[PDB]
Design a protein around this ligand. Structure first.
Ligand SMILES: Nc1ncnc2c1ncn2[C@@H]1O[C@H](COP(=O)(O)OP(=O)(O)O)[C@@H](O)[C@H]1O
Ligand SMILES: [Mg+2]
Length: 378
């Protein structure tokens, strides 16, 4: 028995390929993906939905973004940039590795990034075990195509810490292509997730995939679209509440961001949505209606700029966009209709591969590869 695990920047996903078909496994709360969050409380260690749902109440001890630190040295310039985002403490050890400091059961505990990720993997493992009713040990784990040897080995080590026999580390874009069962074929993976954007151009030759070029933006994702709605709501609240500034309270903002993300999802299938927060700031209730057009308007420049990395990978691959045989939409943010419209137009009306829920495709393909590596050629 071998599973496929997408260890995602913001959400992870686990699937299993049995008898040639892939079942993505929902977790305790019925969610087919699980937040890559770990929280420490006076009494318990929380992972996934429970961790994220409690983040606003305990930001200092709720850890996320471990993928941004795994396999890196603390001094790298990316860590210095990324950290003004994290409410949790990160320090450098003697070896120079990042140490995530939190409080757990009234005590101070430090964890390496791969130890945090091992906790997320262990959760996904248990999710599969509950669904299967039997233990699981073998697994394939995916990583971004640009991950280096240290980041990959640290991800493999996280698997071993979680009790998993890691059969192979594989590239996220190649997993997505495998999911779709894709002569030479030029394949463009457009992966717009919760915190990151990755564009990869692949070639399929004799059933063998080759990554020809990659680009993207490590700080463009759904969360940034949430923040445009948050900025709008902060200005709106000020206009109707005598200039009171909600942004000065971190809890209020986080409560507001949570509702902005919810409404954003609604706007992917409805023409408008409501953002509602009772007692948001002071004792003042907040309520606003957001149309798809206004949401699109607020994010247009960011939506438009997703195409610049697409042009770059094609430039680097010495390839004209008309030579792309398939466009694969990965990442939950590719559910936004305006994003899909921009991609299709850029590729002159070519319909993209999107039938597989975009936040599951990576786990989907990973599970396929896990089955094949287990001797199951079904
Ligand atoms: N229907 C939807 N419309 C717009 N965005 C969505 C929708 N569903 C999920 N998302 C977004 O997708 C993101 C998560 O994508 P995911 O693929 O899990 O990210 P990652 O793989 O980087 O962890 C979140 O920002 C979330 O808001
Ligand atoms: Mg993911």
């Amino acid at each position: 028995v071998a599973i496929g695990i997408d260890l995602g920047t913001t959400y992870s996903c686990v699937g299993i390929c049995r008898n040639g078909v892939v079942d993505i496994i929902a977790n305790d709360q019925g969610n087919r993906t699980t937040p890559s969050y770990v929280a420490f409380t006076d009494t318990e260690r929380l992972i996934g939905d429970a961790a994220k749902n409690q983040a606003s109440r305990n930001p200092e001890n709720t850890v996320f973004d471990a993928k941004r630190l795994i396999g890196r040295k603390f001094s790298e310039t990316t860590v210095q940039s990324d950290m003004k985002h994290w409410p949790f403490t990160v320090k450098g050890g003697s070896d120079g590795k990042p140490m995530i400091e939190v409080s757990y059961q009234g005590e101070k505990k430090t964890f390496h990034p791969e130890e945090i990720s091992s906790m997320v993997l262990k959760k996904m493992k248990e999710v599969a075990e509950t669904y299967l009713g039997k233990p699981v040990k073998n697994a394939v784990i995916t990583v971004p195509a640009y991950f280096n040897d240290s980041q990959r080995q640290a991800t493999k080590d996280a698997g071993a810490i979680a009790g998993l026999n890691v059969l192979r580390i594989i590239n996220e874009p190649t997993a997505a292509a495998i999911a779709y069962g894709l002569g030479e074929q030029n394949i463009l993976i457009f992966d717009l997730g919760g915190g990151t954007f990755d564009v990869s151009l692949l070639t399929l030759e004799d059933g063998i995939f080759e990554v020809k070029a990659t680009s993207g933006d490590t700080h463009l994702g759904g969360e940034d679209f949430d923040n445009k709605l948050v900025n709008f709501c902060v200005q709106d609240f000020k206009k109707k509440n005598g200039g009171k500034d909600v942004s000065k309270n971190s809890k209020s903002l986080r409560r507001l961001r949570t509702q902005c993300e919810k409404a954003k999802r609604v706007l992917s299938s409805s023409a408008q949505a409501t953002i509602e927060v009772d007692s948001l700031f002071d004792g003042i209730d907040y309520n606003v209606n957001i149309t798809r057009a206004k949401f699109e308007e607020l994010c247009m420049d960011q939506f438009r700029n997703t195409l610049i990395p697409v042009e770059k990978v094609l430039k680097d691959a010495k390839m004209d966009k008309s030579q792309v045989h398939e466009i694969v939409l990965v990442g939950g943010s590719t559910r936004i209709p305006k994003i899909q419209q921009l991609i299709k137009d850029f590729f002159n009306g070519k319909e993209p591969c999107k039938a597989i829920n975009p936040d599951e495709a990576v786990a989907y393909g990973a599970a396929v590869q896990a089955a094949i590596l287990s001797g199951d050629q079904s």
